[PDB]
Design a binder for this molecule. Sequence first.
Ligand SMILES: COc1cc(C=O)ccc1O
Ligand SMILES: [Fe+2]
Length: 525
Amino acid sequence: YVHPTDILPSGWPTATDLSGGAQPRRFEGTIFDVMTRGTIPKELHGTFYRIMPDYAQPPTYYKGGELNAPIDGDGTVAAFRFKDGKVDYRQRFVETDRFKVERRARKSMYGLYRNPYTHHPCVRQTVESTANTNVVMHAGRFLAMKENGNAYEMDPHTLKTLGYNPFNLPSKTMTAHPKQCSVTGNLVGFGYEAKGLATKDVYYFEVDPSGKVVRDLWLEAPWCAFIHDCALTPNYLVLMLWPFEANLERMKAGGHHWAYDYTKPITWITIPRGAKSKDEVKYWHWKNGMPIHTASGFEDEQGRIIIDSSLVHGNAFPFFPPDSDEQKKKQEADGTPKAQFVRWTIDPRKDNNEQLPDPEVILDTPSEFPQIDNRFMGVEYSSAFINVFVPDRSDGNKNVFQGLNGLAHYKRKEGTTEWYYAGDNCLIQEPVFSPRSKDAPEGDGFVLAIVDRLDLNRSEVVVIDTRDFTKAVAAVQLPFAIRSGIHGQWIPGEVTPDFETKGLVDLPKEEHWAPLSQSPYDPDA
Ligand SMILES: COc1cc(C=O)ccc1O
Ligand SMILES: [Fe+2]
């Protein structure tokens, strides 16, 4: 009933990812010609890169790792490269300064999320990023990102780490949610806590297609807020502030970086693109809640900023609770918050001191990890591909990151939603979209996502044709499970350096090792 070796002690603390799963994976390597079921679309020409937290060492430095968060673990990138119907896989850890210290020491040397006062003395003045949140290919460079530092660059074929801060941003941080403008090609983004721990400074930038900062601006947030995501429109970058606040004194006392604050309203910072002065920036507010990710934004015909996001009516990261006893009690009392997918209207003609209108409910179901058709980034878009709790086939009492068992294809223009169910005893992660061809209509093509086959100890990539969103056309079947991850991206072959000549796996040499004379076969025999 109980295996004798299973009661042998482990030295690992519980190291969850956002799904709640706690199994360390940590493998680095490849599979050539990954097993597939069904037919891989020949139209897929590119790489699905996904990034996951997977603590490389047992994170036992601070309080035995008891307070490690699911967003903390060392970033590892899995790449699934599709070319002529074949799929290869490669996975590798980002060689962050943190990872390198810990691997070389064979020992955890970092404490609480974003709290250097809980790191090992010898590493306090390192970049503490685990580069584990998102990836982007911009100006021919492949980047792994986490918002508490600049990006690390990796080779897109070998996933070897190449360097830190490739665009030489002057801020200490860069968002893991920069947006690649479909008009200018600019990577548009920001970094908050731009001058160090608990600073209110925010740095806005646009890095052009050549890898140079062409526009930037220093500004501040109204408080030191957790600014995870943003929305790009033709004329604005819009920052989205979560109701957490940082407190240096709390950190110095060995407490968490962030504490949720029920008294903070959701706040937006509009930054006119190419603004010459921080006087052009405006703060907008609604009410308390946690809008985790934007799908995208645009400006309507009358110049209003329209942004769709998830909206959790409470704290989706309960592991960063409020400071006060009163607010802590409220978090416990609230239980699992209501979660939806909503649409915000920020009309720049209006007085920003006036509270924003209530957002419109788009999907009345827990919704997270939305993506769009990237051909429409920073302009009007219609398609969103959304990770969802499937209506009437999902728990509801699970934390928003822990019960995502379907995908939705929402089309604003048609006002339709189509649904993909991951399967019984399955979870599914964030979707990515590949257009059927360069000039396919918006949202016409293939959606890919990682499925956890929970009873099988394996992970799979499903491929869905948008012409029938309810059905997978193919599954890429790994021989094992990988961590449940955060973001991933469909990166077209056309924007990947040497995609035509380099695979994820280098071919062995042509020349035989052995001489002809060693063959068992003789054509004369
Ligand atoms: C995986 O790292 C993070 C993830 C998030 C939300 O998904 C916010 C901050 C992080 O550092
Ligand atoms: Fe994110």
